Every structure is written in structure tokens, then in C-alpha cells.
Amino acid sequence: ATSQVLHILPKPSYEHAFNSQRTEFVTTTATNQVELYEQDGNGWKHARTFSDHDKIVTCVDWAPKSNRIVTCSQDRNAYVYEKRPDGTWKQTLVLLRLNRAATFVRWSPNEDKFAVGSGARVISVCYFEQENDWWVSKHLKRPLRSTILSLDWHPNNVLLAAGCADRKAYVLSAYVRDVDAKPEASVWGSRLPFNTVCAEYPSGGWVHAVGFSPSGNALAYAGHDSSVTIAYPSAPEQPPRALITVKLSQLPLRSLLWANESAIVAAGYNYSPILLQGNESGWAHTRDLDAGTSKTEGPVSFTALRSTFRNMDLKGSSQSISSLPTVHQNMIATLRPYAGTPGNITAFTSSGTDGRVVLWTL
Amino acid sequence: MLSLDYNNIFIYELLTERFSSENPSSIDQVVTDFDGVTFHISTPEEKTKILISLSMKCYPELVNYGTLDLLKQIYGAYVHEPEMGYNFSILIDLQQLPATDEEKEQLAMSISMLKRNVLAAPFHRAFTKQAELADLARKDPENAPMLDKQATSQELMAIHYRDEETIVLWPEHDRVTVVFSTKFREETDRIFGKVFLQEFVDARRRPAIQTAPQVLFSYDPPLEIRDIQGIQKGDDFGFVTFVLFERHFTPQNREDCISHIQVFRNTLHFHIKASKAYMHQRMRKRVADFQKVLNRAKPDVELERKTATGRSFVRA
């Protein structure tokens, strides 16, 4: 595995998405702006800001095939942005009907609908109507008891996992009629109307991250207790084949990604991605992707003269404050596919609270 | 300031104005002082005539120890009937005033010096009686211990000069001993007061200051004051004793020594307050060095170049 630092952003970057051409990426600065960055040979350049939100943006996502960006904020709005032929982006307010902040958003795999987690105890599944040119929201709300910290969709368009602050990971049907085709009878169920519940899986701490296997036949999720759990369902109303919890020795994971049907990368407050490997018999932490796991005169510039005196004056002494050994210097907030066929991730990216955007190849 | 003035500054400045003034204005001025004392200065009959008056709770005791003969000796013609509500009063006339600028200066000093001239009477009684015992002891050195023993119980002065204190003093043929039964009632001054009184005794035990009176301290009373009224051993008082030998009140020194021993407890009270003003300037120095231990947590970024008033600027 190798790390390449794509860009250093001036502000924390809780979320990002690269477009399907991997030529540009959107990211949420810790303000009401969203930055758009483009390639600049080997570098990256700031192309434009979106700024249609009233308060801090919380999450952002970019639909692969249909090329639309979707955004969430503490202002309780979402916007969908779509490219005009002249090269600029058409904003569009989505009426989420949320009583409290929007936390986290994902496009569904067919990109015909998107789901938004909230602090309001609910999830707003949004879809578009060509009859009205509206986006309209359906609220999943029956089992959810607290803030929703992350979402992931099943590779079939219906099922939605959600990690909730009430120490549980939910699997819900988000089937919306006259958008979806019928869901196939599958491990999670077949009687599958909107808001039917396929699992209410336990955790020791808040569930920060969730994600289905590339085959869809297992769920992995990650706790603020610094454990990763993999749940293997059996059938409706029935206990799982296995509910394997692996407890890490590190600070908590905040984001999670199946590399293939037998391996997972995870990352967060430990400042580094880790790799886990296993199957329905058992799982274990197996590698750290960062070589920083191992914790690895001439003329003097004017800026080294000025900074060695400003260090003596502002700080204790001349000596520089050290880097962390990891590539990221602060918690790594999100972890996203980048390359390889779906279900064999060959490379992934991450963006940090330090503002690093980084590409990792396995 | 490192040590207190002996006189009341206000009366010194005020009389230094009116003794220079070509055209006096009227006044009515109550003026507080240490040890619960209070002056009243006013011009009751004419702008020309200043009445200075003094109020002091222990003055009835001080009249027993011969005060009126000392005040009539000092203020002479200027002494007046006590003002109603005041213990003593003096009437100075600005047209009948002394001639020279150095007579005016020493009269303005003398009238501002009233608190230490009224509270001096038991000290002059002790110094002048020690001068008699010093001659009697020089007539018979084997009788001298018995003269000291009887003067220690018969010639003892006690003045309840404020409600949390007593000054007790007596003559013996080679000394005047004076004991301050001293208490700080304000609890943060009681806590520092233990340090200030302890380090005061420990200071006298060093080669540099052996010339000073022998100070001693305890918290129970010296054996010769254990049955005086208001002296009680249990009530968290401290008993600072000074032994003034014949060399601490020789004729050139007597007046400074009386002035300087009365102010004792007031310098400790002042320096306890002025030590909080020190500890604060030493605390905000350590706070300003803990700033550096937090500053190494701010990431390095240049704040943009600005004019002196904080407005933005465009060069370099």
C-alpha cells in the first residue's frame, strides 16, 4: 500500500466526492461554503464555491453516472447541483421537511433517489418527480431513536443501513414506489415495504460508519468503542449466522469501506487507515496501510531566521513542533472508493479534519 | 512607599495651604485615620480660625497616663474647649499665626502630628520613670532587682488602643518593655499575618540587625502581663514584645522611637495588603509564561499585514 497526498485544503474537510472522471472533486470546508477543485497538471486548483446554505455544511456527495452533487447542512436544507450546458452549476433546494440539522447524505446506486440522515430522529429519502419538477422526501422514522451519524445503500436500490447515536446499526427498506423496480427476494427479506426493518444490530458505542459487502450478503459497521462489527444475516425474524466483533487497540474508527468480499479498510481517530480481513468464520485486523504505523549543515533561509526567533518568543524555545508519523495530522473523517471494478477496490481516498485529501492504493 | 508616615498627611497639606494663603476659604472636614481615630477640621466662627479636633476611643485611659500636661506643653496657647463629640480640640488663628516659613512648616507638622502626640503620653511616663529608676539602681545595685520587680507591677501602662489590640508597657532600670497583644480578624490577613509576624521575629536573630530592640513572640502572654484586663491567651492573639534598652531611647532618639513604635501594627497591616499587590504581579508573570505552553498548540499561519489601527494593507 502507498499514500499520495493529492491536496492540502485551508480548512477541515469532513466530506468530499471525486467525479466519475476523477478529474475534479467537491469538498465541505467547515463553513457554509462547498469548494470545487479541478486538476492542474499534477496539482489541484480551486475552481468555484457553492454557498447556497445558511449554516455549516455537514456532508456532500457526487452521483457517478448522472453527474449531480448533493449537499447537507446544519441549516436543515439540502441542495442538488446539476451542470448547465454553459459550464456552471444549477442549484435546487430540496424540501427535506426536517425539524433539526441534516448530518449525512448519499446517492442511491441507481442515482434516482438520495437519503439524508438527521438530528431530528429521522432519515429523509428524497426522489424527483418529472410531473412537478419537485424533489420530495419520505421520512424513515419508526425505529430511529437518536442522531443519524452515517448511511450506506445496499448495491440493490432498496435497502439502507444507518448508524445511529443510540448505539445501534439499523437496516431499513427505502423502497419508494414509482421509482424503484421490485426488490429481489434476498438474505435481508422479500416482504419489503418502506420502513420495514431487517435488523437493529447492537454496538458498544455510537455507530459512526456502516457499509454492505459488495455481494450485499453481509453488513459491516464501526463503533466509537473502537470496534468493527461484521453482521451476517440469515432470513427475516431470524438471528444472524455470525455477528463477529473485532476490538481494535486504537482510537475509534469514523469511516469504513469493503475492499472486496473478504477485506475491509477502516479509518478515523487513529489518524490512519487499517485493513481487516476474514469471512463468516472470523475476522482480524491484519495491516495498517500507513508506514507511519512503524513511527518512521548549510545556509539558513530568512523564514527560518524569523521563525526561530518567533518560536523563542511565542513558544518555549527555538525547536520545531513535530509532525505525527502518520500522513494525516488529525482525525480522518471520510474514506471513499477511487479505482478498480465494483467489489474489488484497488485504490481509495480519504479526507481529514487537517484538510489533507489523500489517495491510497492497496 | 516602604514605611508609613507618622503624621496625618491631610492636616499637614491643608495647614500648609492655609498658612501660605493670602485669602482663606471656609472648611468642614471629618477625616478618618488608623486605629479607629478620627479628626474634625472646621472654621466655625470665621474663615480666619481653624478648629482641629480629635476623637479616639481610648483617650479616657490616656488622660490617666498624664496626656493633658503633654498636650498643654506642646500646643500651649492654641488649646481650646473639647468640641462636642470629640475628646480634644485646638483653635489656630491664621492672622495671629507665627512669623517665619520654618515656624509655619513646623506648626503645620506639629498639628498634623496630633495622633502620635496624644498617644505618646504613656511612653513619656515610662521613659521619664526609667530615668528615675536608672538613678536609684545606680545608688544600690542590690536593691535594683526589687525596684524593677515592684515597677513591673505598679508602674505598668495598658492602653486598649483599638478593640483587637492592647499595648502594654512598663519601665525597669535599663529598659522600657512594650508588648503588643496583636490580632488580625480578617481571615486572609490572619493567614498572611502568621508569616509576617513569624519572619519579623526570625529577622532579629541575624547579625545585620542586632542593634535593634530585642523582639520576642508567643501565642501565651509574657509572665508580667498575664493578669491585665482584655489580655486572654486562647483567643488566637499573638504577643509581640519589644525590649527597648537605654540605647533605643537616648535623648536624640526618644521622639523617633515613640513615633516609630506606635506605628508597628499599622506597618504589618499595610504590608499584608501591599503583599497581595506583589503576589498578583508575580502570578500574572507565571500566567504569561503558561501562555507560551499553549501557543505551541496553535498551528503556524501568518495573520495578514495590517495598518496600526487594524485596517487591511496592500504592500509586500
From Swiss-Prot, chain A:
Keywords: Actin-binding, Cytoplasm, Cytoskeleton, Repeat, WD repeat
A single GO molecular function term of this UniProt record: actin filament binding
Biological processes per GO annotation: actin cortical patch assembly; actin filament branching; Arp2/3 complex-mediated actin nucleation; cortical actin cytoskeleton organization; endocytosis
Compartment annotation: Cytoplasm, Cytoskeleton, Actin patch
Pfam families referenced in this protein's UniProt entry, alphabetically: WD40
InterPro entries in alphabetical order: ARPC1 (IPR017383), WD40/YVTN_repeat-like_dom_sf (IPR015943), WD40_repeat_dom_sf (IPR036322), WD40_rpt (IPR001680)
UniProt key word Thylakoid: no
Start-end of each WD repeat: 8-47, 52-91, 97-138, 143-182, 202-241, 327-361
One GO CC term on file: cell division site
Family of this protein: Belongs to the WD repeat ARPC1 family.
Function (record text): Functions as a component of the Arp2/3 complex which is involved in regulation of actin polymerization and together with an activating nucleation-promoting factor (NPF) mediates the formation of branched actin networks.
Binding partners and assembly: Component of the Arp2/3 complex composed of arp2, act2, arc1/p41-ARC, arc2/p34-ARC, arc3/p21-ARC, arc4/p20-ARC and arc5/p16-ARC.
Protein name according to UniProt: Actin-related protein 2/3 complex subunit 1
UniProtKB/Swiss-Prot annotation, chain B:
Species of origin: Schizosaccharomyces pombe (strain 972 / ATCC 24843) (Fission yeast)
Family: Belongs to the ARPC2 family.
Top-rank taxon: Eukaryota
Record-level GO BP terms: actin cortical patch assembly; actin filament branching; actin filament polymerization; Arp2/3 complex-mediated actin nucleation; endocytosis
Pfam families in alphabetical order: P34-Arc (PF04045)
Subcellular location: Cytoplasm, Cytoskeleton, Actin patch
UniProt-listed InterPro entries: ARPC2, ARPC2/4
PANTHER family in the record: ACTIN-RELATED PROTEIN 2_3 COMPLEX SUBUNIT 2, ARP2/3 COMPLEX 34 KDA SUBUNIT
GO cellular component: actin cortical patch; Arp2/3 protein complex; cell division site; cell tip; cytosol; nucleus
GO molecular function: actin filament binding; structural constituent of cytoskeleton
Keyword check for Cytoplasm: yes
Protein name (database record): Actin-related protein 2/3 complex subunit 2
Keywords, sorted A to Z: Actin-binding, Cytoplasm, Cytoskeleton
Gene name of this polypeptide: arc2
Function of the protein: Functions as actin-binding component of the Arp2/3 complex which is involved in regulation of actin polymerization and together with an activating nucleation-promoting factor (NPF) mediates the formation of branched actin networks. Seems to contact the mother actin filament.
Assembly information from the UniProt record: Component of the Arp2/3 complex composed of arp2, act2, arc1/p41-ARC, arc2/p34-ARC, arc3/p21-ARC, arc4/p20-ARC and arc5/p16-ARC.
